[PDB]
Amino acid sequence: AQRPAKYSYVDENGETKTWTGQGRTPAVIKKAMDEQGKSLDDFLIKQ
Questions:
Q1: Of the residues 8, 23, 25, 46, which has the fewest C-beta atoms closer than 10 A?
Q2: CA-based angle 43:4:16, to the nearest 5?
Q3: Please, which residues have CB within 8 angstroms of residue 45's CB and are 6 or more apart in sequence?
Q4: Within 13 Å of residue 20, how many CA atoms lie on the same side as its CB?
Q5: Where's DNA bound on this chain?
Q6: Are 24 and 4 in contact (CB under 8 A)?
Q7: Contact in structure between 16 and 10 (CB atoms under 8 Å)
Q8: How far apart are CA 42 and CA 47, in angstroms?
Q9: Nearest to 43 by CA among 30, 29, 26
Q10: Which fold has domain 1-47?
């Protein structure tokens, strides 16, 4: 608990849908790969 699941991303809404729960793959990762990793580190918000 009290730890990041794996990563996060936005798509349907401006809010983070999150990878776990019901994100998995293939999903938003398609667009990320299409734009050539436009959110590699940005997935987990801003460092």
A1: 46
A2: 40
A3: 8, 16
A4: 6
A5: 22-27
A6: no
A7: yes
A8: 8
A9: 29
A10: H-NS DNA Binding Protein (4.10.430)
Residues near 18 by beta carbon (within 8 Å), at least 6 away in sequence: 5, 8, 9
Token pair of 21 as six digits: 């729960």
Tokens of 47: 């460092």
Residue 35 corresponds to which tokens in the numbers above? 């734009």
- Method underlying the structure: NMR
- Amino acid occupying residue 47: Q
CA distances from 40 to 1, 2, 19, 36 (A): 23, 22, 13, 9
Q: Kindly give the residue spans of alpha helices, DSSP state H, lying in the chain.
A: 29-34
| Backbone dihedral angles phi then psi of residue 29, each to the nearest 5 degrees | -55, -30
